[PDB]
Amino acid sequence: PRLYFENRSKFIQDQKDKGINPYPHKFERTISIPEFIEKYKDLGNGEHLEDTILNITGRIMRVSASGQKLRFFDLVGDGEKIQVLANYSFHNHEKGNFAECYDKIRRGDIVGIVGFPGKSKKGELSIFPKETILLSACLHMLPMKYGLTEIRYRQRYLDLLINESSRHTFVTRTKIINFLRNFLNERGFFEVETPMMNLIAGGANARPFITHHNDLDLDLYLRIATELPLKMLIVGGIDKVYEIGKVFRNEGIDNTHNPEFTSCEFYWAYADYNDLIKWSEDFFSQLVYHLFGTYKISYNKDGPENQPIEIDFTPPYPKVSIVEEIEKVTNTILEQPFDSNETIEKMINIIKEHKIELPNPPTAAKLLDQLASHFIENKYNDKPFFIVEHPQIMSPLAKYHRTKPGLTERLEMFICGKEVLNAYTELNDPFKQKECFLDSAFCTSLEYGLPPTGGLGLGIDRITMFLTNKNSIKDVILFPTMRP
Amino acid sequence: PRLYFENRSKFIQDQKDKGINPYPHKFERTISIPEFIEKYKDLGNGEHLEDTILNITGRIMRVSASGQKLRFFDLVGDGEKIQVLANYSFHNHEKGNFAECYDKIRRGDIVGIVGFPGKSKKGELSIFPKETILLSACLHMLPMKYGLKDTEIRYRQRYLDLLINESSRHTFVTRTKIINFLRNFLNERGFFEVETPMMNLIAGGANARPFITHHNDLDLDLYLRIATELPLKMLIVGGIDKVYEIGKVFRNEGIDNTHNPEFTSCEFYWAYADYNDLIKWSEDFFSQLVYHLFGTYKISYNKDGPENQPIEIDFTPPYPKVSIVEEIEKVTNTILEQPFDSNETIEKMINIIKEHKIELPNPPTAAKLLDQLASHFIENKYNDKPFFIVEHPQIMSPLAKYHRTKPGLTERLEMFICGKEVLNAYTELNDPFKQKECFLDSAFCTSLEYGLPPTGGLGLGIDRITMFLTNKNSIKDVILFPTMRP
Ligand SMILES: C[C@H]1CCC[C@H](C[C@H]2Cc3cc(O)cc(O)c3C(=O)O2)O1
Ligand SMILES: C[C@H]1CCC[C@H](C[C@H]2Cc3cc(O)cc(O)c3C(=O)O2)O1
Numbered sequence: 025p026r027l028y029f030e031n032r033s034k035f036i037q038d039q040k041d042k043g044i045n046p047y048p049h050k051f052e053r054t055i056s057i058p059e060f061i062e063k064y065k066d067l068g069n070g071e072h073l074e075d076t077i078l079n080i081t082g083r084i085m086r087v088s089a090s091g092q093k094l095r096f097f098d099l100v101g102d103g104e105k106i107q108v109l110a111n112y113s114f115h116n117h118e119k120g121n122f123a124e125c126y127d128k129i130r131r132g133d134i135v136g137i138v139g140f141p142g143k144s145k146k147g148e149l150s151i152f153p154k155e156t157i158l159l160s161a162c163l164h165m166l167p168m169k170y171g172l173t174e175i176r177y178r179q180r181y182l183d184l185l186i187n188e189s190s191r192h193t194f195v196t197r198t199k200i201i202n203f204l205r206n207f208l209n210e211r212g213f214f215e216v217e218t219p220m221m222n223l224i225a226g227g228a229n230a231r232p233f234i235t236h237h238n239d240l241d242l243d244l245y246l247r248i249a250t251e252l253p254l255k256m257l258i259v260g261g262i263d264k265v266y267e268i269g270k271v272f273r274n275e276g277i278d279n280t281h282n283p284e285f286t287s288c289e290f291y292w293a294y295a296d297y298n299d300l301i302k303w304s305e306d307f308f309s310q311l312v313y314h315l316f317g318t319y320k321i322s323y324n325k326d327g328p329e330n331q332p333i334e335i336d337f338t339p340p341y342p343k344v345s346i347v348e349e350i351e352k353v354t355n356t357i358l359e360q361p362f363d364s365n366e367t368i369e370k371m372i373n374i375i376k377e378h379k380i381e382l383p384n385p386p387t388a389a390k391l392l393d394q395l396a397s398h399f400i401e402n403k404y405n406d407k408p409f410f411i412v413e414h415p416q417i418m419s420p421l422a423k424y425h426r427t428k429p430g431l432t433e434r435l436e437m438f439i440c441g442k443e444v445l446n447a448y449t450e451l452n453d454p455f456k457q458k459e460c461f462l463d464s465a466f467c468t469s470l471e472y473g474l475p476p477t478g479g480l481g482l483g484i485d486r487i488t489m490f491l492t493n494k495n496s497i498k499d500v501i502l503f504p505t506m507r508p
Numbered sequence: 509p510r511l512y513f514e515n516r517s518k519f520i521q522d523q524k525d526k527g528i529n530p531y532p533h534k535f536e537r538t539i540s541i542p543e544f545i546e547k548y549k550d551l552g553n554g555e556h557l558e559d560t561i562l563n564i565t566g567r568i569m570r571v572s573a574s575g576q577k578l579r580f581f582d583l584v585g586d587g588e589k590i591q592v593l594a595n596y597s598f599h600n601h602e603k604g605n606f607a608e609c610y611d612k613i614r615r616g617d618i619v620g621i622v623g624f625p626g627k628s629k630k631g632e633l634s635i636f637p638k639e640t641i642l643l644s645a646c647l648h649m650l651p652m653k654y655g656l657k658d659t660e661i662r663y664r665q666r667y668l669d670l671l672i673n674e675s676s677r678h679t680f681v682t683r684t685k686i687i688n689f690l691r692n693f694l695n696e697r698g699f700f701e702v703e704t705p706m707m708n709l710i711a712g713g714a715n716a717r718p719f720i721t722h723h724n725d726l727d728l729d730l731y732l733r734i735a736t737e738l739p740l741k742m743l744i745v746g747g748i749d750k751v752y753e754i755g756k757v758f759r760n761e762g763i764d765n766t767h768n769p770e771f772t773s774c775e776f777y778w779a780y781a782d783y784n785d786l787i788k789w790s791e792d793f794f795s796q797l798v799y800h801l802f803g804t805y806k807i808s809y810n811k812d813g814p815e816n817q818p819i820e821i822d823f824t825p826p827y828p829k830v831s832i833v834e835e836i837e838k839v840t841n842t843i844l845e846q847p848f849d850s851n852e853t854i855e856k857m858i859n860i861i862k863e864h865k866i867e868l869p870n871p872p873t874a875a876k877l878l879d880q881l882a883s884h885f886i887e888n889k890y891n892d893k894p895f896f897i898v899e900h901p902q903i904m905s906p907l908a909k910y911h912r913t914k915p916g917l918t919e920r921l922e923m924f925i926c927g928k929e930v931l932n933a934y935t936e937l938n939d940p941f942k943q944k945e946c947f948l949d950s951a952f953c954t955s956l957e958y959g960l961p962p963t964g965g966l967g968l969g970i971d972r973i974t975m976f977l978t979n980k981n982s983i984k985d986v987i988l989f990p991t992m993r994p
């Protein structure tokens with residue numbers, strides 16, 4: 025263990041003393057492992073192309089029992105593997121002693137090979153080296169397959185080398201974001217970048233990160249959302265605009281919460297709640313189909329040990345009104361204002377009666393949220409669904425519902441009880457922005473005329489979790505935030 | 509003045525009291541203004557399509573009347589403009605008094621218009637309103653084009669700059685086109701985009717004061733990344749042989765025409781590539797990028813501002829390479845012997861600075877003295893064409909691999925446009941033993957010990973690049989919301 029590293033450390037030094045460079049600068053390779061497999065997978069068993077010289081690189085992930093002049097290795101690159109069949113007959117003895125050269129090779133070593141393509145008699149696609157150079161050695165002992173804990177998160181490179189599902193998961197993540205970008209781009213949307221650091225931190229309910237700028241001698245807040253600046257751009261005449269980037273929220277960590285996570289928000293001039301619902305249904309249905317050739321996926325809601333559930337992404341999705349639903353599953357009528365002494369105490373009695381835990385503070389919005397979490401947000405697990413028409417007290421930036429007083433034109437989409445999407449008709453009457461009478465800069469922009477707008481936010485990481493069958497957000501983030 | 513705002517606000521309340529919503533929820537439009545223009549630009553003079561009804565929205569930018577029966581407006585949307593020609597005879601009198609309705613409209617007002625397309629007698633493409641409704645009023649007096657440029661207003665109220673200045677939209681459209689081109693450029697070449705952490709327990713790899721922040725639940729101080737180099741290399745170790753990231757990095761340093769505390773960088777790492785592959789890539793990219801945008805490899809750039817003479821910048825490859833140490837020796841007619849770390853060579857450089865009246869880097873480390881030299885004697889060598897400064901000394905380049913024939917040096921390359929660095933690339937140091945700073949955190953070092961293949965890496969200053977290709981002299985001009993003092 026500690027000895028292995030010391031030996032390899034010595035070996036590197038010993039090689040240098042012998043004038044050999046264990047870390048050469050440039051090895052010009054002529055073909056990639058995936059390319060190699062594609063161009064030679066259909067060779068006949070035992071067939072050799074001994075005249076076709078190739079330069080190929082990879083990482084040795086398996087060394088076979090040294091035979092009498094016959095050495096076998098597994099070589100991996102870009103998530104694919106071919107066999108290394110070193111044969112004494114084909115060895116270039118000008119470059120060095122056969123057995124001595126390959127006896128040096130250890131598992132994990134990155135090597136560059138000069139050889140020709142062919143299959144073994146058994147029909148295994150292989151590269152036959154005439155020469156093998158060491159490009160970069162592995163000084164530690166790699167875990168065996170199925171051998172790899174918190175190591176996955178702290179040493180992600182080891183996860184990517186050993187666990188095949190790892191590369192697939194993060195490839196899917198990029199495919200997801202790519203798809204999202206093209207989806208918004210194909211429909212006339214314009215991607216921008218707003219500031220990570222601001223004098224204030226809206227628009228969402230979350231404790232911010234605070235940092236300090238030295239030469240300006242200024243205390244800056246890390247953005248918790250992108251909503252405000254993007255809406256100012258709508259005012260600026262960018263009628264379809266969006267941003268895919270990191271946002272920072274200074275709260276608790278768990279399976280669905282990571283301090284910094286990727287979000288996408290777009291704002292869509294002259295669109296509304298109804299446009300937004302249709303968009304959501306269009307996007308998720310098409311996205312899931314694009315990844316799986318079907319609108320149905322399997323997801324292990326209760327973990328890999330328990331039976332998975334099926335999630336049907338076939339549109340349309342159910343819409344559930346938050347207040348009405350709570351009233352219906354409670355046989356109660358929550359009379360407005362929701363923050364009245366009568367209604368608050370009535371919500372509290374529901375929370376005590378049903379054995380639910382009381383929020384703190386016991387504000388109207390907090391109570392409504394807790395009631396929703398218990399009586400609604402798990403109503404459907406077999407398909408996405410929207411909770412809609414949130415009260416204004418929960419939605420300080422959502423435009424008032426056009427027929428339901430006290431409510432707003434807002435929609436959250438849930439997958440297996442987890443919020444992945446938040447959208448509403450943007451409040452654009454500056455007079456109704458009670459806080460403005462938020463950021464001064466934002467408030468002022470409204471006064472110049474925000475047209476009728478629809479805004480939407482996506483939780484990218486959580487969406488990745490569901491489409492990569494993960495129970496934790498740590499599985500869809502390359503370098504999640506870990507306690508040291 | 510302020511009386512205008514207060515009157516407008518009062519107007520808003522008065523409309524609310526008379527039973528009308530000055531902020532309606534939804535106006536279902538059927539066509540956009542640019543679509544409108546593209547679909548009827550080839551109409552004939554005086555022609556109408558009076559049975560083709562359209563819903564169209566936009567912002568009123570001009571208001572001219574002619575006898576209380578003809579009202580004229582400029583309607584803009586998506587950076588384009590058409591005329592609004594309101595005629596009493598075409599007006600739908602069931603929706604309200606003609607003169608009254610249009611008397612209420614002010615410059616900046618966003619409106620929804622039900623009407624038909626046509627051209628004026630003079631050939632001005634126009635929407636002919638049968639009905640016009642307020643969607644959202646502008647409560648303030650919108651400045652004219654001379655009320656903005658040039659002030660801080662463009663940087664604090666970017667929305668005003670975007671509405672009134674046509675070039676501003678063009679500028680930020682270009683920025684996005686550039687990032688798109690880069691993403692496609694790398695993606696087409698098999699590169700894999702990823703996201704590495706904004707916050708870490710340490711902050712490498714680069715030479716800059718970091719931002720410091722605190723995580724409350726972990727009870728932990730964290731550093732905003734100054735670069736993305738370390739995590740990406742670790743991913744190379746993970747077998748992601750072509751990886752990259754386009755995002756913000758944070759450097760707590762000084763603010764000027766080429767420095768913003770947060771800025772957008774692109775760093776990629778390319779397994780089994782080296783210094784020469786990097787030079788080729790840089791040349792392929794900038795030439796193709798420039799040509800993609802301009803159909804030519806040559807562009808004009810106002811180095812001294814729009815008031816003074818512009819210069820031409822030829823992005824036709826190849827570009828000049830200049831060895832930093834050898835070049836400094838030539839121009840100063842001195843011989844900087846190694847190690848550069850030595851007191852003797854430090855004394856030489858300090859004297860050259862004294863002799864030439866260059867500001868001393870406090871503190872004057874060898875690396876900073878070298879940089880200050882190259883800055884004063886080399887970095888402005890070429891302005892009419894981009895060029896590389898190469899083969900930086902190892903003491904300037906702790907993560908760059910050593911030069912394979914020139915001792916003390918490394919296989920590194922910085923590219924310059926008008927004396928401003930836009931690119932920093934080099935062959936990566938992959939021998940854990942030669943990274944004596946390991947014997948950056950232990951996470952990165954441990955990873956090198958698992959075998960980093962020979963690799964080339966490169967970093968792009970996206971903002972600065974956007975500056976030169978949008979003809980701007982300040983980075984504040986290519987950032988939507990630049991960092992300002994409150
Ligand atoms: C941008 C928003 C829209 C609603 C869904 C989703 C919620 C968001 C909240 C959130 C808070 C937090 O502290 C940590 C996190 O990882 C998340 C997240 O992933 O998802 O993204
Ligand atoms: C990623 C790097 C590679 C080299 C060029 C360029 C340099 C980088 C340095 C830098 C430092 C700083 O404090 C503020 C800034 O705005 C920049 C910048 O734009 O450019 O980008």
Ligand SMILES: N[C@@H](CCCC[NH3+])C(=O)O
Nearest residue numbers: 228249251446479480481
């Ligand atoms: N910024 C919101 C998402 C957009 C909601 C619609 N303006 C959030 O972080 O939840």
Ligand SMILES: N[C@@H](CCCC[NH3+])C(=O)O
Nearest residue numbers: 714735737932965966967
């Ligand atoms: N991290 C470097 C760019 C990459 C250099 C090559 N590894 C910088 O901030 O300039």
